Amino acid sequence: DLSQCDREPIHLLGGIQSHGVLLAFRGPDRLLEVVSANAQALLGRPPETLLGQPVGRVLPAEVLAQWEPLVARGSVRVVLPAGAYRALLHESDGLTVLELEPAELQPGMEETALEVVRRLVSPLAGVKGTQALLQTAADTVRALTGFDRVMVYRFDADWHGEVLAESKRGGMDGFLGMHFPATDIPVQARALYTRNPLRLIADARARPVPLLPPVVPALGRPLDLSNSALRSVSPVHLEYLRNMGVGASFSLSLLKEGVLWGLIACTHLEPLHISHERRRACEVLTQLLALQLSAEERAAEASEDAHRAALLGQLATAMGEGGTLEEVLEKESERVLALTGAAGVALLLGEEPLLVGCTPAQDEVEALVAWLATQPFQTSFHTDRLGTVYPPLAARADVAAGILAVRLAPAAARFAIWFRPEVARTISWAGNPRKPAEPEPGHQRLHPRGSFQAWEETVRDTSLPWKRADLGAAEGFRGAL
Ligand SMILES: *C/C=C1/C(=C/C2=NC(=C\c3[nH]c(/C=C4\NC(=O)C(C=C)=C4C)c(C)c3CCC(=O)O)/C(CCC(=O)O)=C2C)NC(=O)[C@H]1C
Protein backbone atom coordinates (compact mmCIF):
# COMPACT_ATOMS: atom_id res chain seq x y z
CA ASP A 1 0.00 0.00 0.00
CA LEU A 2 0.87 3.71 0.23
CA SER A 3 3.53 4.34 2.96
CA GLN A 4 5.67 2.37 5.45
CA CYS A 5 3.15 2.80 8.22
CA ASP A 6 1.27 0.23 6.14
CA ARG A 7 4.29 -2.06 5.74
CA GLU A 8 4.85 -3.02 9.38
CA PRO A 9 3.67 -6.64 9.76
CA ILE A 10 1.90 -6.26 13.07
CA HIS A 11 0.85 -9.91 13.22
CA LEU A 12 4.51 -11.00 12.97
CA LEU A 13 6.20 -9.03 15.76
CA GLY A 14 6.95 -12.06 17.90
CA GLY A 15 5.91 -10.59 21.23
CA ILE A 16 3.04 -10.87 23.69
CA GLN A 17 1.94 -8.57 26.50
CA SER A 18 3.40 -9.22 29.94
CA HIS A 19 0.22 -10.04 31.89
CA GLY A 20 -0.28 -13.32 30.01
CA VAL A 21 1.57 -16.44 28.88
CA LEU A 22 1.45 -18.12 25.44
CA LEU A 23 2.16 -21.75 24.54
CA ALA A 24 1.87 -23.38 21.12
CA PHE A 25 1.79 -27.16 20.47
CA ARG A 26 2.19 -29.29 17.33
CA GLY A 27 0.96 -32.70 16.30
CA PRO A 28 -0.98 -35.44 18.09
CA ASP A 29 1.55 -35.79 20.91
CA ARG A 30 0.95 -32.00 21.44
CA LEU A 31 4.64 -31.06 21.61
CA LEU A 32 5.52 -27.62 23.00
CA GLU A 33 6.86 -25.75 20.00
CA VAL A 34 6.42 -22.01 20.62
CA VAL A 35 6.43 -20.60 24.16
CA SER A 36 6.69 -17.08 25.61
CA ALA A 37 9.90 -16.20 27.46
CA ASN A 38 7.95 -15.32 30.63
CA ALA A 39 6.36 -18.79 30.80
CA GLN A 40 7.78 -19.38 34.27
CA ALA A 41 5.02 -16.93 35.24
CA LEU A 42 2.73 -19.96 35.26
CA LEU A 43 4.79 -23.13 34.60
CA GLY A 44 7.01 -23.78 37.63
CA ARG A 45 10.12 -24.19 35.42
CA PRO A 46 12.07 -22.26 32.73
CA PRO A 47 10.39 -22.39 29.32
CA GLU A 48 13.38 -23.17 27.07
CA THR A 49 13.85 -26.56 28.80
CA LEU A 50 10.26 -27.52 27.90
CA LEU A 51 10.56 -26.97 24.14
CA GLY A 52 9.79 -30.37 22.64
CA GLN A 53 7.92 -31.85 25.58
CA PRO A 54 4.43 -33.36 25.22
CA VAL A 55 1.79 -31.21 26.84
CA GLY A 56 1.13 -33.57 29.73
CA ARG A 57 4.63 -32.86 31.04
CA VAL A 58 4.44 -29.09 30.38
CA LEU A 59 1.19 -27.75 31.81
CA PRO A 60 0.22 -27.54 35.50
CA ALA A 61 -2.12 -30.27 36.72
CA GLU A 62 -4.72 -27.48 37.08
CA VAL A 63 -4.81 -26.74 33.34
CA LEU A 64 -4.50 -30.45 32.53
CA ALA A 65 -7.50 -31.25 34.75
CA GLN A 66 -9.53 -28.85 32.56
CA TRP A 67 -8.19 -30.09 29.23
CA GLU A 68 -11.43 -31.65 27.95
CA PRO A 69 -13.73 -28.57 28.18
CA LEU A 70 -10.82 -26.45 27.03
CA VAL A 71 -10.41 -28.43 23.79
CA ALA A 72 -14.15 -28.53 23.06
CA ARG A 73 -15.07 -24.94 24.03
CA GLY A 74 -11.85 -23.08 23.24
CA SER A 75 -12.12 -21.33 26.61
CA VAL A 76 -12.27 -22.25 30.29
CA ARG A 77 -11.56 -20.82 33.72
CA VAL A 78 -8.56 -22.35 35.53
CA VAL A 79 -7.51 -21.68 39.12
CA LEU A 80 -3.70 -21.51 39.26
CA PRO A 81 -1.45 -20.96 42.26
CA ALA A 82 -1.17 -17.40 40.95
CA GLY A 83 -4.99 -16.91 40.80
CA ALA A 84 -7.91 -17.48 38.46
CA TYR A 85 -6.81 -17.53 34.85
CA ARG A 86 -8.73 -17.60 31.61
CA ALA A 87 -7.35 -20.15 29.15
CA LEU A 88 -8.04 -19.67 25.44
CA LEU A 89 -7.32 -21.90 22.43
CA HIS A 90 -7.00 -21.13 18.74
CA GLU A 91 -5.18 -22.49 15.67
CA SER A 92 -2.33 -20.69 13.90
CA ASP A 93 0.21 -21.98 11.33
CA GLY A 94 -0.67 -25.63 12.02
CA LEU A 95 -0.22 -25.23 15.81
CA THR A 96 -2.64 -25.17 18.72
CA VAL A 97 -2.08 -21.94 20.65
CA LEU A 98 -2.93 -21.79 24.35
CA GLU A 99 -3.22 -18.32 25.87
CA LEU A 100 -3.52 -17.77 29.62
CA GLU A 101 -4.44 -14.38 31.12
CA PRO A 102 -5.97 -13.20 34.42
CA ALA A 103 -9.66 -14.08 34.61
CA GLU A 104 -12.63 -11.91 35.60
CA LEU A 105 -12.82 -11.42 39.36
CA GLN A 106 -16.35 -10.02 39.86
CA PRO A 107 -18.97 -12.80 39.98
CA GLY A 108 -21.59 -10.22 38.96
CA MET A 109 -19.92 -8.85 35.79
CA GLU A 110 -22.31 -10.66 33.45
CA GLU A 111 -25.27 -9.50 35.50
CA THR A 112 -23.86 -5.98 35.19
CA ALA A 113 -23.36 -6.63 31.48
CA LEU A 114 -27.00 -7.55 30.93
CA GLU A 115 -28.15 -4.29 32.54
CA VAL A 116 -26.15 -2.12 30.14
CA VAL A 117 -27.35 -4.26 27.22
CA ARG A 118 -30.88 -3.27 28.33
CA ARG A 119 -30.01 0.43 28.04
CA LEU A 120 -29.03 -0.11 24.41
CA VAL A 121 -31.61 -2.63 23.17
CA SER A 122 -34.19 -0.63 25.08
CA PRO A 123 -37.87 -0.23 24.13
CA LEU A 124 -37.50 2.59 21.61
CA ALA A 125 -33.79 3.29 21.99
CA GLY A 126 -32.12 5.97 19.90
CA VAL A 127 -35.40 7.94 19.76
CA LYS A 128 -33.70 11.28 20.48
CA GLY A 129 -31.37 11.05 17.46
CA THR A 130 -28.53 8.72 16.56
CA GLN A 131 -26.25 11.19 18.31
CA ALA A 132 -28.02 10.00 21.48
CA LEU A 133 -27.34 6.40 20.36
CA LEU A 134 -23.56 7.03 20.04
CA GLN A 135 -23.49 8.71 23.47
CA THR A 136 -25.28 5.83 25.19
CA ALA A 137 -22.94 3.36 23.46
CA ALA A 138 -19.99 5.35 24.82
CA ASP A 139 -21.63 5.66 28.25
CA THR A 140 -22.39 1.95 28.64
CA VAL A 141 -18.90 0.78 27.56
CA ARG A 142 -17.23 3.13 30.03
CA ALA A 143 -19.73 2.10 32.72
CA LEU A 144 -18.72 -1.51 32.13
CA THR A 145 -14.94 -1.04 31.61
CA GLY A 146 -14.00 1.68 34.05
CA PHE A 147 -11.91 3.30 31.32
CA ASP A 148 -11.25 7.01 31.89
CA ARG A 149 -12.33 7.97 28.38
CA VAL A 150 -14.48 6.19 25.79
CA MET A 151 -15.07 7.57 22.28
CA VAL A 152 -16.96 6.62 19.11
CA TYR A 153 -14.62 7.10 16.16
CA ARG A 154 -15.83 7.05 12.55
CA PHE A 155 -13.81 6.47 9.40
CA ASP A 156 -14.62 8.96 6.65
CA ALA A 157 -14.47 8.45 2.87
CA ASP A 158 -10.64 8.67 2.66
CA TRP A 159 -10.14 6.61 5.93
CA HIS A 160 -9.16 9.52 8.13
CA GLY A 161 -11.48 9.49 11.14
CA GLU A 162 -13.36 11.76 13.53
CA VAL A 163 -14.64 11.54 17.09
CA LEU A 164 -18.43 11.51 16.89
CA ALA A 165 -19.09 11.06 20.60
CA GLU A 166 -17.21 10.97 23.85
CA SER A 167 -17.82 9.71 27.36
CA LYS A 168 -15.22 10.65 29.94
CA ARG A 169 -14.86 11.04 33.68
CA GLY A 170 -14.80 14.55 35.11
CA GLY A 171 -11.56 16.39 34.45
CA MET A 172 -10.40 14.18 31.59
CA ASP A 173 -9.74 16.18 28.44
CA GLY A 174 -11.07 14.73 25.23
CA PHE A 175 -11.07 14.88 21.46
CA LEU A 176 -14.78 15.30 20.69
CA GLY A 177 -15.24 16.47 17.13
CA MET A 178 -11.55 16.34 16.20
CA HIS A 179 -10.19 14.74 13.03
CA PHE A 180 -7.26 12.36 12.69
CA PRO A 181 -5.19 11.38 9.62
CA ALA A 182 -5.79 7.98 8.07
CA THR A 183 -2.16 7.03 8.86
CA ASP A 184 -2.93 7.06 12.59
CA ILE A 185 -4.57 3.65 11.99
CA PRO A 186 -2.76 2.30 8.89
CA VAL A 187 -4.20 0.00 6.21
CA GLN A 188 -2.88 -3.29 7.58
CA ALA A 189 -4.16 -2.28 10.99
CA ARG A 190 -7.61 -1.73 9.52
CA ALA A 191 -7.54 -5.09 7.74
CA LEU A 192 -6.57 -6.92 10.96
CA TYR A 193 -9.38 -5.19 12.87
CA THR A 194 -11.93 -6.20 10.26
CA ARG A 195 -11.13 -9.89 11.04
CA ASN A 196 -10.35 -9.49 14.77
CA PRO A 197 -12.79 -6.99 16.29
CA LEU A 198 -11.09 -6.70 19.73
CA ARG A 199 -7.70 -5.64 21.09
CA LEU A 200 -6.43 -4.67 24.55
CA ILE A 201 -3.24 -2.76 25.36
CA ALA A 202 -3.11 -3.43 29.06
CA ASP A 203 -0.01 -1.39 29.94
CA ALA A 204 1.36 1.01 27.30
CA ARG A 205 4.76 1.33 28.98
CA ALA A 206 5.56 -2.38 29.55
CA ARG A 207 8.01 -4.21 27.31
CA PRO A 208 6.87 -7.01 24.98
CA VAL A 209 7.69 -10.56 26.08
CA PRO A 210 9.51 -12.42 23.27
CA LEU A 211 8.44 -15.84 22.01
CA LEU A 212 10.88 -18.77 21.94
CA PRO A 213 12.02 -19.70 19.40
CA PRO A 214 11.63 -16.42 17.45
CA VAL A 215 10.49 -18.30 14.34
CA VAL A 216 8.20 -21.29 14.01
CA PRO A 217 10.91 -23.58 12.61
CA ALA A 218 8.73 -25.14 9.93
CA LEU A 219 8.15 -21.67 8.46
CA GLY A 220 11.21 -19.56 9.26
CA ARG A 221 9.18 -16.46 10.35
CA PRO A 222 7.51 -15.57 13.67
CA LEU A 223 4.32 -17.29 14.83
CA ASP A 224 1.24 -15.57 13.36
CA LEU A 225 -0.47 -13.68 16.22
CA SER A 226 -3.51 -12.33 14.29
CA ASN A 227 -6.05 -14.11 16.51
CA SER A 228 -4.07 -13.80 19.74
CA ALA A 229 -5.61 -11.91 22.66
CA LEU A 230 -2.10 -11.28 24.07
CA ARG A 231 -0.46 -9.95 20.86
CA SER A 232 1.90 -7.11 21.66
CA VAL A 233 1.20 -4.17 19.31
CA SER A 234 3.39 -2.11 16.97
CA PRO A 235 6.06 -0.15 18.92
CA VAL A 236 5.14 2.95 16.95
CA HIS A 237 1.58 2.86 18.23
CA LEU A 238 2.84 2.39 21.80
CA GLU A 239 4.88 5.58 21.29
CA TYR A 240 1.75 7.25 19.96
CA LEU A 241 -0.09 6.34 23.20
CA ARG A 242 2.81 7.60 25.33
CA ASN A 243 2.63 10.93 23.44
CA MET A 244 -1.13 11.05 24.17
CA GLY A 245 -0.46 10.43 27.86
CA VAL A 246 -2.38 7.12 27.70
CA GLY A 247 -1.40 4.30 30.05
CA ALA A 248 -3.80 1.63 28.73
CA SER A 249 -5.99 1.15 25.68
CA PHE A 250 -8.88 -0.98 24.45
CA SER A 251 -10.84 -0.61 21.20
CA LEU A 252 -13.58 -2.55 19.44
CA SER A 253 -14.25 -2.74 15.71
CA LEU A 254 -17.62 -1.40 14.59
CA LEU A 255 -18.65 -3.54 11.62
CA LYS A 256 -21.74 -2.30 9.83
CA GLU A 257 -23.15 -4.41 6.98
CA GLY A 258 -19.81 -6.10 6.27
CA VAL A 259 -17.29 -3.28 6.46
CA LEU A 260 -15.17 -1.42 9.03
CA TRP A 261 -17.20 1.69 9.93
CA GLY A 262 -15.31 2.85 13.00
CA LEU A 263 -14.24 1.91 16.50
CA ILE A 264 -15.26 2.28 20.07
CA ALA A 265 -11.87 3.36 21.45
CA CYS A 266 -11.19 3.48 25.19
CA THR A 267 -8.21 5.04 26.94
CA HIS A 268 -6.94 5.18 30.53
CA LEU A 269 -4.23 7.28 32.16
CA GLU A 270 -2.79 4.25 34.03
CA PRO A 271 -2.34 0.56 33.22
CA LEU A 272 -5.62 -1.39 33.27
CA HIS A 273 -6.41 -5.01 32.38
CA ILE A 274 -9.92 -5.98 31.20
CA SER A 275 -10.78 -9.68 31.42
CA HIS A 276 -11.43 -11.70 28.27
CA GLU A 277 -15.07 -12.19 29.34
CA ARG A 278 -15.58 -8.48 30.10
CA ARG A 279 -14.24 -7.57 26.63
CA ARG A 280 -16.65 -10.08 25.06
CA ALA A 281 -19.43 -8.28 26.93
CA CYS A 282 -18.32 -4.97 25.42
CA GLU A 283 -18.39 -6.63 22.00
CA VAL A 284 -22.09 -7.38 22.45
CA LEU A 285 -22.62 -3.67 23.08
CA THR A 286 -20.73 -2.77 19.88
CA GLN A 287 -22.72 -5.19 17.70
CA LEU A 288 -25.83 -3.74 19.34
CA LEU A 289 -24.88 -0.20 18.34
CA ALA A 290 -24.14 -1.38 14.80
CA LEU A 291 -27.58 -2.99 14.71
CA GLN A 292 -29.33 0.15 16.02
CA LEU A 293 -27.40 2.33 13.57
CA SER A 294 -28.34 0.15 10.59
CA ALA A 295 -31.98 0.01 11.70
CA GLU A 296 -32.15 3.78 12.15
CA GLU A 297 -30.46 4.45 8.83
CA ARG A 298 -32.67 2.11 6.80
CA ALA A 299 -35.72 3.71 8.45
CA ALA A 300 -34.46 7.17 7.50
CA GLU A 301 -33.89 5.88 3.96
CA ALA A 302 -37.45 4.55 3.89
CA SER A 303 -39.03 7.76 5.22
CA GLU A 304 -36.99 9.85 2.74
CA ASP A 305 -38.21 7.60 -0.08
CA ALA A 306 -41.84 8.18 0.88
CA HIS A 307 -41.15 11.93 0.86
CA ARG A 308 -39.87 11.85 -2.71
CA ALA A 309 -42.77 9.58 -3.71
CA ALA A 310 -45.13 12.13 -2.15
CA LEU A 311 -43.44 14.86 -4.19
CA LEU A 312 -43.69 13.36 -7.72
CA GLY A 313 -47.30 12.70 -6.80
CA GLN A 314 -47.91 16.35 -5.87
CA LEU A 315 -46.13 17.38 -9.07
CA ALA A 316 -48.37 14.94 -10.99
CA THR A 317 -51.52 16.47 -9.51
CA ALA A 318 -50.08 19.91 -10.35
CA MET A 319 -49.52 19.16 -14.00
CA GLY A 320 -52.85 18.66 -15.70
CA GLU A 321 -54.33 21.27 -13.43
CA GLY A 322 -54.04 23.54 -16.46
CA GLY A 323 -51.19 25.31 -18.17
CA THR A 324 -48.07 24.11 -19.90
CA LEU A 325 -45.35 21.97 -18.37
CA GLU A 326 -43.01 24.95 -18.04
CA GLU A 327 -45.87 26.85 -16.39
CA VAL A 328 -46.66 24.32 -13.70
CA LEU A 329 -42.97 23.62 -13.10
CA GLU A 330 -42.31 27.33 -12.55
CA LYS A 331 -45.13 27.59 -10.00
CA GLU A 332 -44.15 24.25 -8.47
CA SER A 333 -40.51 25.35 -8.26
CA GLU A 334 -40.21 24.54 -4.55
CA ARG A 335 -41.36 20.95 -5.05
CA VAL A 336 -39.17 20.43 -8.12
CA LEU A 337 -36.11 21.50 -6.16
CA ALA A 338 -37.19 19.50 -3.09
CA LEU A 339 -37.08 16.22 -5.08
CA THR A 340 -33.28 16.21 -4.80
CA GLY A 341 -32.75 18.79 -2.05
CA ALA A 342 -31.49 21.21 -4.69
CA ALA A 343 -31.20 24.98 -4.78
CA GLY A 344 -31.84 25.23 -8.55
CA VAL A 345 -32.74 23.26 -11.66
CA ALA A 346 -32.20 23.81 -15.38
CA LEU A 347 -34.50 21.95 -17.78
CA LEU A 348 -33.59 21.40 -21.43
CA LEU A 349 -36.99 20.42 -22.81
CA GLY A 350 -35.96 21.24 -26.41
CA GLU A 351 -35.02 24.92 -26.72
CA GLU A 352 -33.13 27.29 -24.44
CA PRO A 353 -32.98 25.91 -20.88
CA LEU A 354 -35.69 26.71 -18.34
CA LEU A 355 -33.89 28.08 -15.26
CA VAL A 356 -35.60 27.55 -11.89
CA GLY A 357 -34.02 28.52 -8.56
CA CYS A 358 -30.45 29.76 -8.52
CA THR A 359 -28.59 28.19 -11.43
CA PRO A 360 -25.55 29.50 -13.31
CA ALA A 361 -26.50 31.96 -16.04
CA GLN A 362 -27.99 30.81 -19.34
CA ASP A 363 -24.62 30.60 -21.09
CA GLU A 364 -22.97 28.40 -18.44
CA VAL A 365 -25.99 26.08 -18.58
CA GLU A 366 -25.54 25.77 -22.36
CA ALA A 367 -21.84 24.94 -22.04
CA LEU A 368 -22.40 22.30 -19.35
CA VAL A 369 -25.20 20.69 -21.36
CA ALA A 370 -22.83 20.41 -24.33
CA TRP A 371 -20.17 18.81 -22.10
CA LEU A 372 -22.52 16.36 -20.37
CA ALA A 373 -23.57 15.16 -23.81
CA THR A 374 -19.96 13.90 -24.18
CA GLN A 375 -19.40 11.91 -20.93
CA PRO A 376 -20.46 8.27 -20.31
CA PHE A 377 -23.14 7.95 -17.63
CA GLN A 378 -26.03 5.80 -18.89
CA THR A 379 -28.96 7.85 -17.56
CA SER A 380 -27.84 9.89 -14.54
CA PHE A 381 -24.69 11.77 -13.66
CA HIS A 382 -23.84 13.33 -10.29
CA THR A 383 -20.89 14.86 -8.38
CA ASP A 384 -20.47 16.88 -5.16
CA ARG A 385 -17.34 18.74 -6.48
CA LEU A 386 -18.13 19.81 -10.04
CA GLY A 387 -14.87 21.80 -10.18
CA THR A 388 -12.46 18.87 -10.12
CA VAL A 389 -13.97 17.45 -13.31
CA TYR A 390 -15.39 20.53 -15.09
CA PRO A 391 -13.08 23.58 -14.75
CA PRO A 392 -15.43 26.14 -16.39
CA LEU A 393 -17.68 25.97 -13.31
CA ALA A 394 -14.88 25.45 -10.78
CA ALA A 395 -15.08 29.03 -9.40
CA ARG A 396 -18.91 29.02 -9.09
CA ALA A 397 -19.15 26.90 -5.97
CA ASP A 398 -21.70 29.50 -4.82
CA VAL A 399 -24.31 27.97 -7.14
CA ALA A 400 -22.80 24.81 -8.72
CA ALA A 401 -20.47 22.88 -6.40
CA GLY A 402 -22.60 19.78 -6.97
CA ILE A 403 -24.86 18.75 -9.81
CA LEU A 404 -27.22 15.92 -10.56
CA ALA A 405 -28.06 15.37 -14.24
CA VAL A 406 -30.48 12.93 -15.92
CA ARG A 407 -30.87 12.20 -19.64
CA LEU A 408 -34.21 13.02 -21.22
CA ALA A 409 -33.39 11.68 -24.70
CA PRO A 410 -31.21 8.87 -26.17
CA ALA A 411 -28.74 10.69 -28.44
CA ALA A 412 -30.16 14.20 -28.07
CA ALA A 413 -28.91 16.55 -25.34
CA ARG A 414 -32.01 16.77 -23.15
CA PHE A 415 -31.52 16.95 -19.41
CA ALA A 416 -32.73 17.91 -15.99
CA ILE A 417 -29.75 19.22 -13.98
CA TRP A 418 -30.24 20.06 -10.30
CA PHE A 419 -27.61 22.32 -8.68
CA ARG A 420 -26.26 22.62 -5.15
CA PRO A 421 -24.07 25.31 -3.56
CA GLU A 422 -20.99 24.46 -1.57
CA VAL A 423 -21.24 23.73 2.18
CA ALA A 424 -18.16 25.06 3.97
CA ARG A 425 -17.03 22.92 6.93
CA THR A 426 -14.39 24.15 9.38
CA ILE A 427 -12.68 21.03 10.79
CA SER A 428 -10.29 20.65 13.72
CA TRP A 429 -7.40 18.21 13.25
CA ALA A 430 -5.67 16.82 16.34
CA GLY A 431 -2.25 18.00 15.27
CA ASN A 432 -0.96 19.30 11.95
CA PRO A 433 -2.10 16.84 9.24
CA ARG A 434 0.64 17.97 6.87
CA LYS A 435 3.05 16.41 9.42
CA PRO A 436 1.29 13.20 10.48
CA ALA A 437 4.47 11.49 11.78
CA GLU A 438 8.04 12.39 12.66
CA PRO A 439 10.39 10.15 10.65
CA GLU A 440 14.07 9.94 11.42
CA PRO A 441 16.56 11.14 8.79
CA GLY A 442 16.72 8.38 6.19
CA HIS A 443 13.13 7.17 6.89
CA GLN A 444 13.83 3.81 8.54
CA ARG A 445 12.43 4.27 12.05
CA LEU A 446 9.31 6.51 11.97
CA HIS A 447 7.76 7.97 15.13
CA PRO A 448 4.28 9.36 15.87
CA ARG A 449 3.67 13.08 15.79
CA GLY A 450 4.47 14.97 18.97
CA SER A 451 1.41 17.22 19.39
CA PHE A 452 -2.36 16.68 19.05
CA GLN A 453 -3.24 20.39 19.45
CA ALA A 454 -6.20 21.70 17.42
CA TRP A 455 -5.40 22.67 13.84
CA GLU A 456 -8.19 24.23 11.85
CA GLU A 457 -9.07 24.03 8.17
CA THR A 458 -12.17 24.92 6.19
CA VAL A 459 -13.10 22.60 3.35
CA ARG A 460 -14.60 24.59 0.45
CA ASP A 461 -16.22 24.01 -2.94
CA THR A 462 -18.09 20.79 -2.12
CA SER A 463 -21.82 20.29 -1.72
CA LEU A 464 -23.73 17.98 0.55
CA PRO A 465 -23.48 14.44 -0.91
CA TRP A 466 -26.22 13.31 -3.21
CA LYS A 467 -28.31 10.82 -1.22
CA ARG A 468 -29.78 7.62 -2.62
CA ALA A 469 -33.24 9.11 -2.28
CA ASP A 470 -32.01 12.06 -4.42
CA LEU A 471 -31.04 9.79 -7.33
CA GLY A 472 -34.25 7.81 -7.00
CA ALA A 473 -36.34 10.96 -7.12
CA ALA A 474 -34.54 12.18 -10.24
CA GLU A 475 -34.88 8.88 -12.12
CA GLY A 476 -38.59 8.93 -11.33
CA PHE A 477 -39.04 12.48 -12.59
CA ARG A 478 -37.61 11.69 -16.05
CA GLY A 479 -40.88 9.98 -16.93
CA ALA A 480 -42.87 13.17 -16.38
CA LEU A 481 -40.65 15.08 -18.86
C1 LIG B 1 3.59 5.34 10.71
C2 LIG B 1 2.68 4.64 11.68
C3 LIG B 1 1.85 5.26 12.49
C4 LIG B 1 0.93 4.53 13.40
C5 LIG B 1 0.88 3.23 13.50
C6 LIG B 1 -0.22 2.42 14.15
N1 LIG B 1 -1.41 2.83 14.95
C7 LIG B 1 -2.14 1.56 15.34
C8 LIG B 1 -3.24 1.33 16.06
C9 LIG B 1 -4.23 2.36 16.56
N2 LIG B 1 -4.15 3.69 16.36
C10 LIG B 1 -5.22 4.27 16.97
C11 LIG B 1 -5.46 5.77 16.93
C12 LIG B 1 -6.18 6.48 17.76
N3 LIG B 1 -6.45 6.26 19.23
C13 LIG B 1 -7.31 7.40 19.74
O1 LIG B 1 -7.70 7.51 20.86
C14 LIG B 1 -7.53 8.28 18.56
C15 LIG B 1 -8.36 9.56 18.55
C16 LIG B 1 -8.87 10.06 19.65
C17 LIG B 1 -6.87 7.75 17.42
C18 LIG B 1 -6.84 8.33 16.00
C19 LIG B 1 -5.99 3.28 17.54
C20 LIG B 1 -7.29 3.39 18.34
C21 LIG B 1 -5.38 2.10 17.29
C22 LIG B 1 -5.93 0.74 17.76
C23 LIG B 1 -5.20 0.20 18.99
C24 LIG B 1 -5.70 0.82 20.30
O2 LIG B 1 -4.91 1.52 21.00
O3 LIG B 1 -6.88 0.60 20.71
C25 LIG B 1 -1.33 0.43 14.73
C26 LIG B 1 -1.67 -1.04 14.90
C27 LIG B 1 -1.31 -1.47 16.32
C28 LIG B 1 -1.50 -2.99 16.37
O4 LIG B 1 -0.51 -3.75 16.60
O5 LIG B 1 -2.64 -3.48 16.15
C29 LIG B 1 -0.16 0.96 14.04
C30 LIG B 1 0.93 0.19 13.28
N4 LIG B 1 0.13 5.56 14.16
C31 LIG B 1 0.57 6.95 13.70
O6 LIG B 1 0.13 7.97 14.11
C32 LIG B 1 1.63 6.77 12.65
C33 LIG B 1 2.92 7.47 13.08
Author numbering: 9 to 489
Recite the paper's sentences:
The reported structures are of a SaBphP2 PCM in the wild-type (wt) and mutant forms determined at 1.65 Å and 2.2 Å, respectively. The cryostructure of the His275Thr mutant is essentially identical to that of the wild-type, except at the location of the point mutation where the hydrogen bond to the ring D carbonyl is absent. The conserved Histidine, although absent in some myxobacterial BphPs such as SaBphP1, stabilizes the Pr state by forming a H-bond with the D-ring carbonyl and the Pfr state by forming a H-bond with the C-ring propionate. Serine is absent in the SaBphP2 wild-type protein, and likewise, the mutation His275Thr diminishes the Pr/Pfr photoactivity, possibly as there is no stabilizing amino acid for the D-ring and C-ring propionate in the Pr and Pfr states. Upon Z to E isomerization and by rotation of the D-ring about the C15=C16 double bond, the conserved Histidine 275 must move.
